[PDB]
Design a protein around this ligand. Sequence first.
Ligand SMILES: *[C@@H]1O[C@H](CO)[C@@H](O[C@@H]2O[C@H](CO)[C@@H](O[C@@H]3O[C@H](CO[C@H]4O[C@H](CO[C@H]5O[C@H](CO)[C@@H](O)[C@H](O)[C@@H]5O)[C@@H](O)[C@H](O[C@H]5O[C@H](CO)[C@@H](O)[C@H](O)[C@@H]5O[C@H]5O[C@H](CO)[C@@H](O)[C@H](O)[C@@H]5O)[C@@H]4O)[C@@H](O)[C@H](O[C@H]4O[C@H](CO)[C@@H](O)[C@H](O)[C@@H]4O)[C@@H]3O)[C@H](O)[C@H]2NC(C)=O)[C@H](O)[C@H]1NC(C)=O
Ligand SMILES: *[C@@H]1O[C@H](CO)[C@@H](O[C@@H]2O[C@H](CO)[C@@H](O[C@@H]3O[C@H](CO[C@H]4O[C@H](CO)[C@@H](O)[C@H](O)[C@@H]4O)[C@@H](O)[C@H](O[C@H]4O[C@H](CO)[C@@H](O)[C@H](O)[C@@H]4O[C@@H]4O[C@H](CO)[C@@H](O)[C@H](O)[C@H]4NC(C)=O)[C@@H]3O)[C@H](O)[C@H]2NC(C)=O)[C@H](O)[C@H]1NC(C)=O
Ligand SMILES: *[C@@H]1O[C@H](CO)[C@@H](O[C@@H]2O[C@H](CO)[C@@H](O[C@@H]3O[C@H](CO[C@H]4O[C@H](CO)[C@@H](O)[C@H](O[C@H]5O[C@H](CO)[C@@H](O)[C@H](O)[C@@H]5O)[C@@H]4O)[C@@H](O)[C@H](O[C@H]4O[C@H](CO)[C@@H](O)[C@H](O)[C@@H]4O)[C@@H]3O)[C@H](O)[C@H]2NC(C)=O)[C@H](O)[C@H]1NC(C)=O
Ligand SMILES: *[C@@H]1O[C@H](CO)[C@@H](O[C@@H]2O[C@H](CO)[C@@H](O[C@@H]3O[C@H](CO[C@H]4O[C@H](CO)[C@@H](O)[C@H](O)[C@@H]4O)[C@@H](O)[C@H](O)[C@@H]3O)[C@H](O)[C@H]2NC(C)=O)[C@H](O)[C@H]1NC(C)=O
Ligand SMILES: *[C@@H]1O[C@H](CO)[C@@H](O[C@@H]2O[C@H](CO)[C@@H](O[C@@H]3O[C@H](CO)[C@@H](O)[C@H](O)[C@@H]3O)[C@H](O)[C@H]2NC(C)=O)[C@H](O)[C@H]1NC(C)=O
Ligand SMILES: *[C@@H]1O[C@H](CO)[C@@H](O[C@@H]2O[C@H](CO)[C@@H](O)[C@H](O)[C@H]2NC(C)=O)[C@H](O)[C@H]1NC(C)=O
Ligand SMILES: *[C@@H]1O[C@H](CO)[C@@H](O)[C@H](O)[C@H]1NC(C)=O
Ligand SMILES: *[C@@H]1O[C@H](CO)[C@@H](O)[C@H](O)[C@H]1NC(C)=O
Ligand SMILES: *[C@@H]1O[C@H](CO)[C@@H](O)[C@H](O)[C@H]1NC(C)=O
Lengths: 320, 98, 346, 66
Amino acid sequence: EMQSLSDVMIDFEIPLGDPRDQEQYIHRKCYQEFANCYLVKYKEPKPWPKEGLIADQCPLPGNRQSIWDYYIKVESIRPANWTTKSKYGQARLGSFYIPSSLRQINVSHVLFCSDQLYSKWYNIENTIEQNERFLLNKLNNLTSGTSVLKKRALPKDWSSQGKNALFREINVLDICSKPESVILLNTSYYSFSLWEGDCNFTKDMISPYACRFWRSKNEKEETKCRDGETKRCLYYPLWDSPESTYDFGYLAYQKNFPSPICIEQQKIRDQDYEVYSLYQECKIASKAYGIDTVLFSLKNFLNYTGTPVNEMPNARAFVG
Amino acid sequence: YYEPHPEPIVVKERVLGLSQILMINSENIANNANLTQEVKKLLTEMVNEEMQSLSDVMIDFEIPLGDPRDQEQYIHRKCYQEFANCYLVKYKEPKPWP
Amino acid sequence: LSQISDINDENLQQGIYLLRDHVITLMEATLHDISVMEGMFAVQHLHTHLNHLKTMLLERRIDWTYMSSTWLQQQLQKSDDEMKVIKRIARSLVYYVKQTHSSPTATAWEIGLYYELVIPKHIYLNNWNVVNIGHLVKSAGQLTHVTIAHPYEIINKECVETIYLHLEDCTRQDYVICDVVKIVQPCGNSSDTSDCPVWAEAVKEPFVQVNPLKNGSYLVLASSTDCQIPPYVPSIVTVNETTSCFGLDFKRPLVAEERLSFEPRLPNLQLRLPHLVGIIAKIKGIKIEVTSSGESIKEQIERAKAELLRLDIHEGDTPAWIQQLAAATKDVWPAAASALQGIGNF
Amino acid sequence: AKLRSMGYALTGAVQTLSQISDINDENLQQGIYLLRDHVITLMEATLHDISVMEGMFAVQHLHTHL
Ligand SMILES: *[C@@H]1O[C@H](CO)[C@@H](O[C@@H]2O[C@H](CO)[C@@H](O[C@@H]3O[C@H](CO[C@H]4O[C@H](CO[C@H]5O[C@H](CO)[C@@H](O)[C@H](O)[C@@H]5O)[C@@H](O)[C@H](O[C@H]5O[C@H](CO)[C@@H](O)[C@H](O)[C@@H]5O[C@H]5O[C@H](CO)[C@@H](O)[C@H](O)[C@@H]5O)[C@@H]4O)[C@@H](O)[C@H](O[C@H]4O[C@H](CO)[C@@H](O)[C@H](O)[C@@H]4O)[C@@H]3O)[C@H](O)[C@H]2NC(C)=O)[C@H](O)[C@H]1NC(C)=O
Ligand SMILES: *[C@@H]1O[C@H](CO)[C@@H](O[C@@H]2O[C@H](CO)[C@@H](O[C@@H]3O[C@H](CO[C@H]4O[C@H](CO)[C@@H](O)[C@H](O)[C@@H]4O)[C@@H](O)[C@H](O[C@H]4O[C@H](CO)[C@@H](O)[C@H](O)[C@@H]4O[C@@H]4O[C@H](CO)[C@@H](O)[C@H](O)[C@H]4NC(C)=O)[C@@H]3O)[C@H](O)[C@H]2NC(C)=O)[C@H](O)[C@H]1NC(C)=O
Ligand SMILES: *[C@@H]1O[C@H](CO)[C@@H](O[C@@H]2O[C@H](CO)[C@@H](O[C@@H]3O[C@H](CO[C@H]4O[C@H](CO)[C@@H](O)[C@H](O[C@H]5O[C@H](CO)[C@@H](O)[C@H](O)[C@@H]5O)[C@@H]4O)[C@@H](O)[C@H](O[C@H]4O[C@H](CO)[C@@H](O)[C@H](O)[C@@H]4O)[C@@H]3O)[C@H](O)[C@H]2NC(C)=O)[C@H](O)[C@H]1NC(C)=O
Ligand SMILES: *[C@@H]1O[C@H](CO)[C@@H](O[C@@H]2O[C@H](CO)[C@@H](O[C@@H]3O[C@H](CO[C@H]4O[C@H](CO)[C@@H](O)[C@H](O)[C@@H]4O)[C@@H](O)[C@H](O)[C@@H]3O)[C@H](O)[C@H]2NC(C)=O)[C@H](O)[C@H]1NC(C)=O
Ligand SMILES: *[C@@H]1O[C@H](CO)[C@@H](O[C@@H]2O[C@H](CO)[C@@H](O[C@@H]3O[C@H](CO)[C@@H](O)[C@H](O)[C@@H]3O)[C@H](O)[C@H]2NC(C)=O)[C@H](O)[C@H]1NC(C)=O
Ligand SMILES: *[C@@H]1O[C@H](CO)[C@@H](O[C@@H]2O[C@H](CO)[C@@H](O)[C@H](O)[C@H]2NC(C)=O)[C@H](O)[C@H]1NC(C)=O
Ligand SMILES: *[C@@H]1O[C@H](CO)[C@@H](O)[C@H](O)[C@H]1NC(C)=O
Ligand SMILES: *[C@@H]1O[C@H](CO)[C@@H](O)[C@H](O)[C@H]1NC(C)=O
Ligand SMILES: *[C@@H]1O[C@H](CO)[C@@H](O)[C@H](O)[C@H]1NC(C)=O
């Protein structure tokens, strides 16, 4: 459509001033490009610790879930002498494997561009124009000259002085929808396990599904072949397969039956995050250096990693 | 005295005349879009509606060029649009599935 | 022509040249977007395209969707901006529509489209309309309006140079299009300038004209003075404070911000007229040619002399005639005019 | 070659207003007065109907608008 129009119309000089000088043009252009884009700084650089994630609150395949990207399947056919240690390290086959890219030692900041972490003041039932004004006022009220957010803006998990004035808290089901966000931003890892063995929970120690562990341990891991120790051999897993049930730890998390749930915390990062607003920075820097320069400068910063964070699907747009 | 004349002015050199023939065939469209026999009806209705409306207001004009039926490009494209993927296989001799 | 490229041949003439062979086009090949859509999403996208096409053809426009830009530009050999102009002004004709096959599940149709593409020789952007205000003259008792027949209708000024255009055989297809455009010189009394004819016409006294100009000034031509403004010569008038002149309110304009000007600046010109021009315009009763811009004293005089001489003294209107002789003689010999006036009133 | 027309910027002067409401001012004259600042408009904000549509339905609605 746009090209067709472009192809028949020449340019005309109009005797008003340059839009680049006008505040409404500056403010609306920084908004259309950087409204929801924020930079978070760790107190110091500390990655997610483990490669294997136990997270039974998520349903398994058998809607789609984003965490199924990291799900390890259990396969009945394997090569000879095959072991999980050889491929997924210390992950439990049938759970989730976190790649080394998400666990970089030197990552000091997290850049994200999404609306999904705002506290109650934000509602998609309200109008675009209203939500704009509400954000625009909050970002003025939460900032003094610079682009650094006041600690008040943050959730309690990222700062002692956080009062959720801009951002909500991350919850237990957020891992299933938004994996990367949790892995990069959570200050602590919390498990949620219905696996027989964890927290020493033995099958006797219980003081259609009922009181049962989802996956029980088997004797060992093994394979057997028939003069063909290469391609196709039967595999016997160290734990059960959840394919038949698939809803168990989800339906357990929503309490529809009692069960022996296990939860353990593990600290990762100090609760002293700092947050910058790229929208507020765009407004501010454009007063000194003009918008053309600032816009091009900040657009390159969204591509620091080589993929521009703003073109990613909304829920998955988190980068260290 | 004088006033502006905002509109451009073009000096003519020559005119070039062209004839273009547009050909439409709903089966080609219905194959690609994996359409069902029900939606093939909708496509056929929708196309006739638009084409008939145009047909109803426009009379016929003689254009002083040779007949398209004599032109290769017309022949090639018509045979294609119709028969491109149509083939005839002959058995060595007639033998059915047993 | 065997190729579109041939249209650029220098030893052609201004006319219509047809490409010899028909362009053949299948819609299924043209509309890529539908090819990847499925079910009713495909159907509705096509409906939008077909309805658009129909809309363009009713307005005699060309829907360029069904022709390759690059191919056309590579055949025509033209700049990006020239192609914009070419594609704006080109017009379409439907010479046949034909259903070729009809089944309850399947149809086919054919359409014959004829296009005429104007090829530009030149394009002019910064243009002014002319307006001819003339001058008033008082002569042997008669008020006369005098005008020069200018040989151009447009002034153009792209950058610095100012050009005077005569146009012929024009039409509007968004822009103005003309067959013939002749560059001309302004009027003057010299070899290098145009020798334009001068027209006179008798007019009723008092004559007042006041045109409010858009920028806030007023254009005045009046037989009489008011607010200091000289009579007979026209002028562009501006005031610092609202006042009444000629029975209407000349307002102070609003302050404006300055910008780069493209206003023309015509040559000045001195024009001699016949001594009795007011009488010559009067006895005709119509707007009449009196001189040319360049014309010699001798040729200017021998023009109306026989006519004027045959306005001789008659038994029936001697007093009237004597009064006209006094008005004619006043400026030449005042002492004879006062005498003739006295005899006339006697 | 690069075209651009001065057809609306030929005269070398411009009369401007701070507010659309100013156009009603009695002691103006017949002429062209420009509002001094550009109106700035996002289409996302302007088309509410597409905001609550989803998938190819949203896309086809916008196509009809454009
Ligand atoms: C509403 O709209 C109307 C317009 O539609 C507005 O009216 C217009 O307002 C303009 C002001 O913005 C006026 O322009 C001004 O004209 C003045 C008068 O110009 C004439 O005199 C000049 C001086 O002549 C004497 O002195 C010289 C020596 O210096 C002697 O040689 C002479 O004998 C005299 O003694 C003279 O230079 C001008 O000559 C040019 O114009 C005539 C035709 O008018 C041509 O015959 C000439 O060829 C010549 O034009 C060519 O050369 C000049 C440079 O020499 C170029 O600029 C031209 O483009 C062209 O190539 C006239 O005889 C000017 O004095 C005055 O000058 C100011 O600006 C210049 C810079 O541009 C400065 O350097 C000066 O110092 C000074 O500040 C200016 O040009 C228009 O006349 C007027 N239009 C009409 C038709 O009336 C109206 O006001 C608007 N109202 C509102 C409310 O907005
Ligand atoms: C990313 O970061 C977010 C935080 O922003 C994090 O979300 C939090 O996740 C934790 C862990 O699931 C949530 O806390 C748990 O909530 C359970 C439900 O709370 C109700 O019950 C308590 C009282 O029981 C009430 O006070 C409360 O108001 C609710 O009504 C709660 O049962 C959990 O408590 C058990 O576990 C903790 C673990 O430290 C323990 O301290 C408690 O005493 C309690 O006992 C333990 O129970 C488990 C089994 O249930 C057993 O294994 C263990 O042996 C027991 N230990 C003891 C000592 O008895 C716990 O409070 C928290 O609410 C979430 N916050 C939000 C904002 O949602 C995500 O999980 C993080 N994601 C990842 C992947 O890291
Ligand atoms: C366009 O431009 C032309 C050229 O300027 C205008 O015509 C001229 O007008 C002027 C002013 O009225 C005339 O000036 C007078 O000239 C005579 C002398 O004329 C004789 O000598 C000239 C020498 O160059 C010669 O050109 C003349 O030839 C013309 O006339 C003869 C005779 O009829 C004819 O045969 C030719 O074919 C030519 O047509 C001629 O031989 C001079 O005596 C006058 O003196 C008076 O004015 C001066 C100055 O005020 C004063 O000092 C004296 O005391 C005296 O009062 C005066 O200079 C000129 O003759 C005109 N030339 C022509 C060719 O007509 C023309 O009118 C302009 N047109 C328009 C429409 O405005
Ligand atoms: C009739 O013609 C007049 C010319 O004879 C017009 O007067 C000119 O109007 C301009 C309007 O912009 C004045 O500019 C103002 O100047 C003062 C200060 O004066 C000093 O600076 C100017 C140039 O800025 C200089 O020209 C002066 O000589 C002084 O040195 C500023 O405070 C204003 O902001 C504004 O710039 C001209 O000064 C003035 N010139 C003359 C010669 O009068 C008049 O406006 C026309 N009026 C009508 C009824 O049309
Ligand atoms: C109309 O229906 C056909 C048949 O279903 C559609 O073609 C199919 O399209 C899919 C997706 O492009 C193809 O699957 C992919 O094939 C590649 C190559 O093998 C493989 O790498 C992928 O893993 C995946 O399997 C599928 O092969 C293809 N089937 C056929 C028979 O061509 C078609 O897209 C539909 N189109 C429309 C517009 O209705
Ligand atoms: C984001 O950054 C990447 C990496 O620097 C840019 O990708 C390069 O782009 C150039 C320009 O055409 C190519 O020639 C290179 O081959 C690309 N290299 C890689 C590693 O992709 C990319 O252009 C940037 N994109 C945006 C939208 O900013
Ligand atoms: C990480 O930082 C350390 C200390 O500066 C350095 O030795 C190492 O090369 C860095 N590695 C990467 C992957 O950045
Ligand atoms: C039992 O629980 C404690 C909790 O700290 C742990 O240290 C120990 O390793 C567990 N032992 C077994 C046999 O699971
Ligand atoms: C940019 O450089 C100019 C001098 O070239 C200087 O005046 C200006 O203050 C600098 N800073 C900004 C924000 O433009």
